[PDB]
Amino acid sequence: MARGPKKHLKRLAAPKAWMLDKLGGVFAPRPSTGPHKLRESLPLLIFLRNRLKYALNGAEVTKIVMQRLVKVDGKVRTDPTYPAGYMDVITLEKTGEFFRLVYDVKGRFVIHRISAEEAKYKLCKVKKTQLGAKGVPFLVTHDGRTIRYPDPLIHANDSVQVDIASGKITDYIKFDSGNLCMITGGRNLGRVGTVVNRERHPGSFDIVHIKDSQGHVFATRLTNVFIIGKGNKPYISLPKGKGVKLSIAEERDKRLAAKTH
Amino acid sequence: GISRDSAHKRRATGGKRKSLRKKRKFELGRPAANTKLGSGRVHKVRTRGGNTKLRALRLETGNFAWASEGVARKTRIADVVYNASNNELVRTKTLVKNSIVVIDATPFRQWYEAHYVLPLGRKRNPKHAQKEDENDVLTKKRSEKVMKKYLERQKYGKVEQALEDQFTSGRILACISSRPGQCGRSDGYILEGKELEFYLKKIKSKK
RNA sequence: UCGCUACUACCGAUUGAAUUAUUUAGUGAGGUCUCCGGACGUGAUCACUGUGACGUGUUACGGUUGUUUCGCAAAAGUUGACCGAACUUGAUUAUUUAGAGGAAGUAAAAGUCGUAACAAGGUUUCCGUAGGUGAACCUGCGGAAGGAUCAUUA
RNA sequence: UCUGGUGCCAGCAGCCGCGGUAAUUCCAGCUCCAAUAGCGUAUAUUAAAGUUGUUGCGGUUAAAACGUUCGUAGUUGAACUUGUGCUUCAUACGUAUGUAAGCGUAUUACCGGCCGGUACUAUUACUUUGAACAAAUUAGAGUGCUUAAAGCAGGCUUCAAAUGCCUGAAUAUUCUGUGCAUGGGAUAAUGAAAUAAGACCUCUGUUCUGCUUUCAUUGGUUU
RNA sequence: AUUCUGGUUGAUCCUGCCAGUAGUUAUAUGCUUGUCUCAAAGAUUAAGCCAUGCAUGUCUAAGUACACACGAAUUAAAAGUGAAACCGCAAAAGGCUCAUUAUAUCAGUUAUGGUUCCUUAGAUCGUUACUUGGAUAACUGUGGUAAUUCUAGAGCUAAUACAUGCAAUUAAAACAUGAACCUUAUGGGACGUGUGCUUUUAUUAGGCUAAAACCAAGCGAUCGCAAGAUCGUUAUAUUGGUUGAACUCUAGAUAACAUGCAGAUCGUAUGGUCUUGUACCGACGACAGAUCUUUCAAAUGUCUGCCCUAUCAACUUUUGAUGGUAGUAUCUAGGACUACCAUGGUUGCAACGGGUAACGGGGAAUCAGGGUUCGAUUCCGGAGAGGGAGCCUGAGAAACGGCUACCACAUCUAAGGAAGGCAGCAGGCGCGUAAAUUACCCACUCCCAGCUCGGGGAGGUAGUGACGAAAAAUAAC
RNA sequence: AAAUUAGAUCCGUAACUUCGGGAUAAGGAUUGGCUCUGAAGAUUGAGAUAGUCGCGAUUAUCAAUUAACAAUCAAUUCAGAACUGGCACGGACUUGGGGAAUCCGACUGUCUAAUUAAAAC
Secondary structure, X not given: OOOOOOOOOEOOOOOOOOOOOOOOOOEOOOOOOOOOOOOOOOOOOHHHHHHOOOOOOOHHHHHHHOOXXXXXXXXXXXOOOOOOOOOXXXXXXXXXXXXXXXXXXXXXXXXXXXXXXXXXXXXXXXXXXXXXXOOOEEEEEOOOOOEEOOOOOOOOOOEEEEEOOOOOEEEEEOOOOOOOEEEXXXXXXXXXXXEEEEEOOOOOOOEEEXXXXXXXXXXXXXXXXXXXXXXXOOOOOOOOOOOOOXXXXXXXXXXXXXXXX | OOEOOOOOOOOOOOOOOOOOXXXXXXXXXXXXXXXXXXXXXXXXEEOOOOOEEEEOOOOOEEEEEOOOOOOOEEEEOOEEEEOOOOOHHHHOOXXXXXXXXXXXXXXXXXHHHHHOXXXXXXOOOOHHHOOOOHHHHHOOOOOOOHHHHHOOOOXXXXXXXXXXXXXXXXXXXEEEXXXXXXXXXXXXXXXXXXXXXXXXXXXXXXX
């Protein structure tokens, strides 16, 4: 507001969780204020020219999205810099692509081509159940899709799968000490499952303990904790192999050293 | 303009903070209302972002509410008797929040015996030597529609002695509860139980 | 010590001089707000006038009319507050600079005068403190050895 | 310790020092040595500096213990408390427990199939591992831009046809401390029970507080 | 790449400094220079002034188009391009600079339940002609002053500009009030009335362990012949809510409130249906709509952390200083401001004052460690546009490539008057030890607009360039 | 010679100094009329609950009052505000000009009645 609100944003000031190069321009994609926040976004100059390499300039992206070929979450989204954060199903039926943006274990995202049958619903967590929207009830989602008239047993800290054609709940996965989860936001990013125990600190900032399939017990805040099903329940397709909590030398030993060529 | 935050205004040790950010708009202040009892003026000021509040210099009427009823009858505002912020605000009859005020006492009394037909507080019986003829056009009982509801009350109809004496004079003590320089109105509640006995001890014992 | 030749920094009448910001009082441009104000420009009624219609009793259409009722906003100008530039004055700082004269310092050995100290430096030295003296210095009182006695004197 | 020139001259020299008609130091010739597309000079700054001293100085005489003692702020402060023993067994080789279990009367009460929900945590400093948070820089992983400083690419099947594949684009110092989570309880302070406003108990009912379940609904008598 | 040598003496051992020594994205300067890859660059002194030039504009089949400027043909559909002009949006970002500023900025942490918000996405939209009113630019026409900048007068005309205005706003249902209803009870009604949201005030519920002893209606039910007497079942302390909570909070009801706001808009298709007859309905977007939830943010506040100085030891409080209290004011807390009380508040653990050749932090230079010095400088944050002050419009500015005045400088003038701020990019003067072209284009990275297409001296790109880094001619057999 | 200043309230006040001063330093602001408002006192405080006898007259009390206890009564002063005119307002009168130094005498005191009041005593 103080002569704001800062329409620009610089390269080497946009995050390197989108893996931008230091040379290549002064500036950075600057997502145009959609459902997801700025540091938790991937603007659609990144996903089309830098990742899929369908383009090679920046001008060859507005010659893609303005023809309504792109389709973020079923709706068209001809915005050339739409934020399109976590689990936003970019369902390109032409030329039959069907991605989903799920985050990699190295702190970053990863391109994950998913099945077209489970592409048309996605999983999203809830934030605040409240009254006032029609008629009395509604809840807000992690991207902010307010959806009315929910189940009265879905409290906060849980997730529901949303169909991409409707806006309606079909299944709820609630926060118990048996449910596998996924972390997005901290140093522990991309690591998947499973919960052990949550330390409730009254006012505020609860943390929770998560045990990976390797026995790798660790912890993070409850803010960063998504939830993706019960014990040994992948309710969505995950990318490359679960985010095992690889060692630092083992990735230098798995494919970097143990390399057929 | 008038400014509202502490660019000036030395610190908690006694020391002079010097300069601090030439002058910014978002910490501005405005000249006050000083809403007198002149009838019917409102200027509206464009405020912080996009909005507008009503600077109601010179009001005369207010939506006053007898709190012990669940009623809110609009009256006019007669006198500004007492005020705890100043006496420059009493004497110039300026209406701000909780000025003790005098209103009408009539649109409550007609509402009173509408639902609580019991006649009190009663005036001088030389006037009351005949009715025109009220006690049957009050209820008439119909044998028997909606109206026996007026006699499982009389448990409500014993309004206190220090309020019914103030109804026979036809002007009652109230209290402002709005922000006339902001809300554009001078509404409020009226003194009943011990807000009354404090603000009335404040007047006649001080004189 | 004194004398010539330089150089720096002090003290100093002038109640000197030039800034620098910070304010007390004073005046004061503008503007926000406010009390009025009401150019012009409508509304609109009061009548109507041009005609027809009814029963001339009444009305329809035209006259940017007559002219009174009733508004609606609104420019100039204004009253009062409030922000306040700005100059004028006073004080307060914080620097810089001119000064007769005065007095210390340094460089400059090669000037004059004497020899203060280091050898028992020819009066052992030094200290504190006072006074005196061309100059180093002298003298009193007290102290110390960094002394020229580590001392032998039941 | 070259050759001519000049003669306390001209000048050179960061400092020490040279030069006064033989100069290894000047000025030139003939050579030589350093670094090399470079190198010299000036100012600042770091190292040198054990000459600023936390690591790490000095104070009898070299610069330096106040003339003396009191003394508040401050800085520092004696020892003392569950320490272990046995019984063991899991575990390096009759020996070695380095994980643990059994006696010092009870290291926190229930149900679940040794195992989970579960009631209960004197304190602070310190310390363990965390969380949490900009990038560039820095540390630096990987990589034949020909190399290099860089760069964040590229590579392969392969000279191919070929959405034809493969993996990148690390991990950290940093943003040192504050603050938070968790383990520890050595070290170091405070804390407690004094003629007991001490503890459990005498669980006595002497005193309590209160209000949602039922007096059909709804009101009174009240345990 | 944890090291030292010369210099006090007739010689000695020391203390000691001086002189050497090397690095410096560290500045200038001296001499010379064959390439080539990257490239810092008016910061220091003068945030001192500045010739000229440019740096902010924008259109979709989709707000408005009467231009023969160009298209066609008696179709209003021209649906073409659309100049202009109106309206909408943006011009508050970027870019430059470092004067101010010493718990202030800033950094981290935590808060906003103390607030506000264009946009963006998501959800949401009943309690008397239904299709309208007038008036202006563009355009035509005649004008003025030294002066182009400026603007008047008249004739035309639009809308998603301005203004009014829903007969289904439509009630049953819900529900007070009466009403043609009329009975020993957890009892019944035609209809007349009324019940948008929002603001304001006021009220009441507000997240919740179990039973009877006894009792009036004796209805459910029982007994007494009965007047009736003893009892008794459940639907009845029936709203999210932080899972830290009288969150005055998002919800709801009650009694009001005043005053506004409320979809008379647009392109592409039209057929279901033809009587081609306003009987019959898609997909889209919008000057726009309103409430709630998000998001790009902001602005305040929390807890810690800053350089030199005591030849600065006590400061603050008349004229707010520390608190209480009621107010005002603001978007909101709050001495922020007012009025009344209270006399507090900071201090040797350095307050207060002064200095600063001080924008803070990331970071930079240099060492074995511990460290010292620097940071005008490309990134985040603050700050400001000659000096101060004021302010309009706007969701956003105390904006200066906006305005208004004063002050200082300058400008034009026919003497009446009119306009100006390069610490944007280039360029000139000046000061200086000290710093380049009055070049080229938006292909890049992104930003903005009505928005595939326009614009952007942001940005990229050549010219100068021994600041600084890298690979290496000046021979070889 | 004359003019200037002058009462009072408030703020502020230098060199020197025998630390008493200087000092009313200097320098500034305020001031009428009219309507209210605030503050500063005193003295009795004020007594709540049978009815004998016929509420009436003979007829009760520890304390708590209290945080304006309530009336009476009393003088006068000081702060505040609003309005208000030819700025005329201490409206007459009463009523200091100030400052930078030099010389002498320290100071207050005394003196040449009738020419010297001083630095003289």
